[PDB]
Design a protein around this nucleic acid. Structure first.
Ligand SMILES: CCCCCCC(=O)N(O)CCC(=O)O
Ligand SMILES: [Fe+3]
Lengths: 78, 94, 103, 407, 107, 95, 79, 107, 94
DNA sequence: CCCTGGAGAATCCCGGTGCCGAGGCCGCTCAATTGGTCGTAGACAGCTCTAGCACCGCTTAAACGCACGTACGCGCTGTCCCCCGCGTTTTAACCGCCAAGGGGATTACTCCCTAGTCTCCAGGCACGTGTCAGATATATACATCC
DNA sequence: GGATGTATATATCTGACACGTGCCTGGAGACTAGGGAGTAATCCCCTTGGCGGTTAAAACGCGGGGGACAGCGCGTACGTGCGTTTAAGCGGTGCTAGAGCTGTCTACGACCAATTGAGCGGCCTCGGCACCGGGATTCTCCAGGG
């Protein structure tokens, strides 16, 4: 139960960077599920990449490749 | 004159094992050929990139299995892996 | 400091605009570190046992997640402004995710 | 390099026009001679009009030597006295020592980084105290001098405005030290106090706005908006007088007047605050704006309601001879003494507002002071008294002597 | 004495060609060298997917009292399944039409 | 007579069942040639390229209209307006 | 003025297949503009592919490749 | 005596390497053969793009009264351009932030 | 011990041609390396597919030019083609 | 009741630490240059014939323009609850330092699997032909809207 | 109930799908050789785990006012039906141009051998900013003497 560690002030900060003035009280439970889905997909892909190479440590290159496979290219980690 | 190739005969053979009464038109045959080509290209490209990532120059069944797991969703990957494993096992023995 | 008496000195939503202008100007990560690490390890524990993570992997994951959430919040804001409102609701997020092609 | 496609870049009102325009042309201030500023004048007028005294003849003031400097103030109050300073740009407060303030003030204009102003140096119980005396008439009507238990006032030793050491409302004598270019934005002085203000050296420009119900609503709304850097209030009101006070003038500002101040030259001012019995309704009104706009207690009149309770007691006692002080406070007052009546309508109206106010506060806000015995019986008595005084003859009330005085 | 030939499809038990797949992998600019187990695996996967889609299309055709398969049946089979609609999400089928769907507000 | 909102449902049900092309051929060919003239002169065209272009365009427009209808329903309405199209195309990423 | 060939009834038929009930009067110009932009985007790539091969006739494979370059894979016209 | 060597980069008038790009193309599994003018053309194109990016980043950095380039300047330059924003539309830049944008209905 | 490759020195050389005084931190250098690799991968893949489509076995500068025209937006492509042609012309003249 | 000097303390001109990120030489090993040889991929000339373009008539299904009336969009009020701002107590995130061992990265070397060649031959592609699944005409039955 | 949109059920044409053959070229069988990777041994980096101190962020409660939502009235623009006008589709002609295929001749990129200098990793400066840091100049607390 670590999803409850994403506190409401953090979601408020993210929304403020997004450009939102007022926030309803039911947004947080939806945001947490969205984040769960995103993380689950990315981590599953990265774990498959790691397992193919016969390793036990998830490197940053595995995460970069997993993100690139989904169309979310990232710069600044090799 | 030049002669071209397609997958029509194998598609018809597969169709006859699940629906011996049902026929098919030519448009559906062209669509099925396009689908087969698309899937083949996807799997081959993924396997090539997997081979390049680990500093290797050969393509083996391990990379094909990994690409199948990466591309197909849910139970499709499971059944495809089982079918491929069975086919390879039966081919090696003979 | 002791309280002072007889010292003379002249002098909803106003703080929100200042917070928006402050956060749209910085560049650091807005979520904590340890809770995110624990969440990632708990999620990954379902696919394999006794896994290890590099630090840069977790950093990249956090950055990608935050960028995704910020973009989703901007699209939700546009959806909310469409319906003649100023307050965002879950149906705005649902509409944005459905139009984007994620559902 | 070349061979490219072939760029871009990667207080909001003007205080100077508010000083130049001719639009702030109301006539609210009366120029007076000192001799006409007496208790009779207050009884007849209720101290409703801002006054300028172009000279001090007849006022009964005393000032220090005319070349007195900020370093002299410093030596009188102490190099180590902490002083509230205002950052002009923000209208927020900072704190420094008087010696640090003096160094800033003696720094050449071009060398000062920011504009700072000292408007809140209360110097009672320092060496400077006896060098400054306020207009005599004020002593006759100030609630501090006439209503607060005298043995408490006399016991004050602390020369700062530290609230835990404060035995009475220490708001009577302030030194203001202002460099050229200082500006204090629009405000009402704390508690609805009236203010006397003497330009010892230099000069000041005031914008004055009358406390009509409409202007006081604008004022509160302007404070609640938080947009005081953006809006010059003197534009938003019905009527505003801009007026210059020169060196040697003494200015009296009635309760509730909304005012802003600009300093055109380095200046030293002596002034002070007082509540009085002739404009109680306005005093209470200001207090309630402070409450609603959440002014911190630091910036307010100390012991405000406490003082109001003591005011009721003094009126009852002086008129009926019935004391609502504790036995011990009666005794303290008696020891100090040994060392049919016609009220003005100003006072009658004031006292009915005051009684209604104090009676209606809940226990946790009533602030009944320690000298008061039975506050319910005091209230009951004030109500009886006001009924019996309701037929006061306005002519006969103009005695030139306050009802409440120490014997 | 060269014995009688025997295709690798018969050895593996598949109805898709294996030698053709091996040639396409070899001449497709994918890797320097190609292992000997890839073609059978790829052929098996392709055959499985083909059989699944064909079975769904045949059922859809039989529901409409016909004996042939047209692009409409393939479109219905693909868009009526939760797993094949995710694998072919961005693919357009010529002469396929859409799925019956009316919003509840307009009715 | 029929009350408004009954013929529209009949047409929706009719057109969700058919599979033909809903645009005429000659105007589409004219538009395609007129557009293509701006990149190279004297271009010939096969008989199936125009058909493929027509199919792709029609599928694109149908998807866009579905998204526009979703947008319109969001705003407590039953009529589609240009602002719904603009919102849908902006959220998609095309603008 | 060939863009006027796309007529109001055709747009209404497309909207009906999309599932709308009521249509405003300012939709047609927007639809025509969007369709024109899409057509130019595809035809530019198709003509570039035709030019590279030293030809004068745009074939079906050129259109198929141009569509595939933009994530709009089409089945039934070759592959 | 063998003639004194001279690199192809200088021979063409470039700063980006040509031999390294030629080796990458040859060992990258792209075609069976590689011509002789491809690496020069590719290196020229890459150098052009890099020069444009660096010029914009330097202008943006100097506009803030600084002497060093950081990822924020690259992000500002890329997102404030109209053509480079289309080429890098789907790219996330680490520690770059967002552009200042506030809707009018909110102010 | 083994060494790795990068594009840092050429990035410095190009930087000293448009802004001599300013420097650059390491994170921006990593970002630039990623950008260069991404663009090279895109162009090489497109040229490979173009060569495949025409039944050809070699990659020349014509394929690279066509890929540049296909991938770059607007006047960027024009300037890139012009500069590449200039470089090729100056290289073959020697 | 005023001086005064035995302790005081503040901060701070500045007189040292001291890490932090860039920035610059040196050695040297491996990768880019240079010089030849050849053999197949690509350019060019010539011939064929399939399909793309231009044209004419006419049938008629579709597009166009008008009446109209109603129903859905839009603006104005009210009220009531839900969200924002602020103060205070509580909790855990963050940082410095220490220790241990799991596992990633490198290096020999041995052999077995995959590439290149030479024949044989059958699987699949192009060319021909029949019949059966599907479209459409047309007189009822039934559910559906007014 | 009455008028209308849609489903019910048989006849006959008809042309495209499925079944045959002839043959040719790519897959299969058998052979040789060479280098890619699989495995063991080894070393040291870097990931996990623990604890103390500090304080900055999170949580809880209260007041109040601002916006969201429902209700009502107006009005104009869009859906429906009809009489008129247009060019889209279909069938058949005629031409020719450019895509496709065959055959030669050559010149350019791959492979090999010998050589040397370029860029990369490992240390040496180099101009900042975060603390210290006695001590000490200026001004100062404190019960004595005067
Ligand atoms: C409360 C102290 C006594 C009155 C003086 C301070 C004040 O409230 N002013 O209006 C003067 C401001 C100025 O001179 O800049
Ligand atoms: Fe004042």
């Amino acid at each position: 139960d670590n999803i409850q560690g994403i506190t409401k002030p953090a979601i408020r900060r993210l929304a403020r960077r997004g450009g939102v003035k007022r926030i309803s009280g039911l947004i947080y439970e939806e945001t947490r599920g969205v984040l769960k889905v995103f993380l689950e997909n990315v981590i599953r892909d990265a774990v498959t990449y790691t397992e193919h190479a016969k390793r036990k440590t998830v490197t940053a290159m595995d995460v970069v490749y997993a993100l690139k496979r989904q169309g979310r290219t990232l710069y600044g980690f090799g | 004159r030049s002669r071209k190739e397609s997958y029509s005969v194998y598609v018809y053979k597969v169709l006859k094992q699940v629906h011996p009464d049902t026929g098919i038109s030519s448009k559906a045959m062209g669509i099925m050929n396009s689908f087969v080509n698309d899937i083949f290209e996807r799997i081959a490209g993924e396997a090539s990139r997997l081979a390049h990532y680990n500093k290797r120059s050969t393509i083996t069944s391990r990379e094909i299995q990994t690409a199948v797991r990466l591309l197909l969703p849910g139970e499709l990957a499971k059944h495809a892996v089982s079918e491929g494993t069975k086919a390879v096992t039966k081919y090696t023995s003979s | 400091a002791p309280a002072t008496g007889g010292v003379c000195k002249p002098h909803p939503g106003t703080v929100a605009l200042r917070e928006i202008r402050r956060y749209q100007k910085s560049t650091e990560l807005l979520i904590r570190k340890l809770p995110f690490q624990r969440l990632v390890r708990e999620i990954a524990q379902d696919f394999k046992t006794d896994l290890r993570f590099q630090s840069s992997a977790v950093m990249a994951l956090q950055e990608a997640s935050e960028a995704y959430l910020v973009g989703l919040f901007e699209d939700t804001n546009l959806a909310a402004i469409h319906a003649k409102r100023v307050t965002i609701m879950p149906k705005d997020i649902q509409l944005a995710r459905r139009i984007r092609g994620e559902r | 390099r070349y061979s490219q496609r072939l760029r871009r870049r990667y207080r909001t009102f003007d205080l100077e026009e508010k000083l130049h325009t001719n639009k702030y042309n109301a006539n609210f201030v009366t120029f007076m001679e000192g001799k006409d500023f007496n208790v009779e004048y207050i009884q007849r007028g209720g101290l409703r009009d801002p006054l300028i005294f172009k000279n001090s003849d007849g006022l009964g003031i005393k000032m220090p030597d005319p070349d007195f400097t900020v370093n002299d103030v410093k030596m009188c109050v102490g190099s180590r006295r902490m002083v509230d300073v205002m950052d002009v740009n923000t209208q927020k407060g900072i704190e420094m020592t008087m010696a640090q303030w003096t160094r800033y003030y003696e720094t050449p204009e071009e060398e000062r980084e920011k504009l700072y102003n000292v408007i809140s140096l209360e110097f009672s119980h320092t060496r400077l105290e006896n060098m400054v005396q306020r207009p005599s008439t004020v002593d006759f009507i100030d609630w501090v001098d006439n209503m607060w238990p005298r043995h408490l006032k006399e016991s004050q030793t602390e020369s700062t405005n530290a609230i835990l050491e404060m035995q009475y409302p220490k708001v009577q004598k302030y030194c203001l030290m202002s460099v050229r270019g200082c500006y204090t934005d629009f405000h009402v002085d704390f508690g609805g106090t009236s203010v006397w203000y003497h330009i010892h050296q230099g000069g000041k420009v005031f914008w004055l706005i009358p406390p009509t119900a409409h202007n006081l609503e604008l004022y509160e709304n302007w404070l609640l908006s938080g947009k005081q850097g953006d809006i010059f209030l003197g534009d938003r009101v019905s009527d505003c007088q801009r007026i210059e006070l020169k060196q040697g003038y003494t200015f009296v500002i009635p309760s509730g007047w909304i005012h802003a101040v600009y300093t055109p030259t380095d200046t030293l001012v002596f002034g002070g605050n007082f509540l009085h019995s002739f404009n109680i309704p306005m005093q209470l009104k200001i207090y309630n704006i402070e409450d609603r706009t959440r002014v911190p207690n630091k910036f307010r009149y100390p012991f405000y309601y406490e003082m109001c309770w003591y005011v009721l007691e003094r009126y009852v006692y002086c008129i009926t001879n019935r004391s609502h002080l504790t036995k011990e406070f009666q005794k303290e007052s008696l020891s100090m003494d040994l060392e049919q009546v016609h009220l003005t309508h100003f006072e009658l109206e004031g006292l009915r507002c005051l009684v209604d106010k104090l009676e209606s506060l809940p226990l946790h806000k009533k602030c009944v002071p320690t000298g008061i015995e039975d506050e319910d019986a005091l209230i009951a008595d004030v109500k009886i008294l006001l009924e019996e005084l309701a037929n006061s003859d306005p002519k006969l009330a103009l005695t030139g002597v306050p009802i409440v005085q120490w014997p | 004495a060269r014995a009688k030939a025997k295709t690798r499809s018969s050895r593996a038990g598949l109805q898709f060609p294996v030698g053709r797949v091996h040639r396409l992998l070899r001449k497709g600019n994918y890797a320097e060298r190609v292992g000997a187990g890839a073609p059978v695996y790829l052929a098996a996967v392709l055959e499985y997917l083909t059989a699944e889609i064909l079975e769904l299309a045949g059922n859809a055709a039989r529901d409409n009292k016909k004996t042939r398969i047209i692009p409409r049946h393939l479109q219905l089979a693909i868009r009526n399944d939760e797993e094949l609609n995710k694998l072919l999400g961005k693919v357009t089928i010529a002469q396929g039409g859409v799925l019956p769907n009316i919003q509840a507000v307009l009715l």
